[PDB]
């Protein structure tokens, strides 16, 4: 939506004198804009900006403030945006003007965001993002609060509105590029706005942009620690199934690496990795590893994620973890349960403490109200016999034999199925 | 889904094989045990 109106505005020039003659602007302002329009070559533009720099931003502000018809205001805004594209350093003239006026840069521009035209307001937003991201003067306090509040309100609209939310997210990203704005945005409820707009089925480009933002947050250790209060990963894992596009797949992989890299604690890494594995990210990483892509980042990140997810799977497969989940009632398909190598290595560990692990399992076989826990108990009891031959008589002693051969008639088909698997384990041979 | 379908099918097949292999021998053992009581009980008044 931005591009066509920008192109039209580049051409929709009109006489700036129309407003000087109406006494809405000053003669020097009109003269500056006319001279700058005539002075088109790069050297001439620099000469104007360096000879009349104090008048430059003042002319822009005066015309934007006092002009009724949009075309001229949009012309100024598009000119500033294109001048920043030509040379990003052009943010410096506004700061020079503000300092000469003994003022900060923000009160001049922030009110523009409340104007009527979506094009003009969002172009002002792009200009503000460029200015306050490149310049020494960051946005702070009530000013940044209102600016990100405006970002939030534009997001709240959630299509031309979505295509403008493209610019909203672009400004947000160009700001988060610098650390301070990241903490400001996390302090605000803006991350909740990202969650809301993502869940509200926003468009593909917007998905890439918000995953860009969460990837920026994950880059920082403390912001990565902060964002768990939302837990994007359950959304992102399944949305990756549809977003096969290289853009989105790459950025989500990068955000995943950032989570598992910049997680501050071993427990933080375990939380993120557990979300991943219980939402089945590991098989997807194996599939993507079989797949091959254009650039380094996608495949290097898939390889790193395979490394770290494998390490997390081994950790969860730790014998101490198995005992601790048995103690904590978390018989809910942690990777230890299906990691066959763990079972081969540690099936004897179920004899430890005089078969306390099997005792927990066989007490849960008549104490577990949760069908998941009951089924996992029966299945683990069967796996014990599968992996440790002498366990046949131990299970007969503890009643796991009878308990599973009965619970294959349990009221929940999942429990019935797992109990049938366990009884098959017992009957693997004599 | 399909990978697991095949895996579980093969598992059940091999399990059927093993179970039948054990079952036939143990059933013949049951029958020999039964008839050997009649073989033994000619004058089996003592304990053994």
Swiss-Prot record, chain B:
It is found in: Cytoplasmic vesicle, Clathrin-coated vesicle membrane; Cytoplasmic vesicle, Secretory vesicle, Synaptic vesicle membrane; Melanosome. Subunit of the V0 complex of vacuolar(H+)-ATPase (V-ATPase), a multisubunit enzyme composed of a peripheral complex (V1) that hydrolyzes ATP and a membrane integral complex (V0) that translocates protons. V-ATPase is responsible for the acidification of various organelles, such as lysosomes, endosomes, the trans-Golgi network, and secretory granules, including synaptic vesicles. In certain cell types, can be exported to the plasma membrane, where it is involved in the acidification of the extracellular environment. Required for assembly and activity of the vacuolar ATPase. V-ATPase is a heteromultimeric enzyme made up of two complexes: the ATP-hydrolytic V1 complex and the proton translocation V0 complex. The V1 complex consists of three catalytic AB heterodimers that form a heterohexamer, three peripheral stalks each consisting of EG heterodimers, one central rotor including subunits D and F, and the regulatory subunits C and H. The proton translocation complex V0 consists of the proton transport subunit a, a ring of proteolipid subunits c9c'', rotary subunit d, subunits e and f, and the accessory subunits ATP6AP1/Ac45 and ATP6AP2/PRR. Interacts with SPAAR. Belongs to the V-ATPase 116 kDa subunit family. This is V-type proton ATPase 116 kDa subunit a 1. It comes from Rattus norvegicus (Rat). The gene is Atp6v0a1. The chain holds residues 100 to 147 of 838 of the full protein.
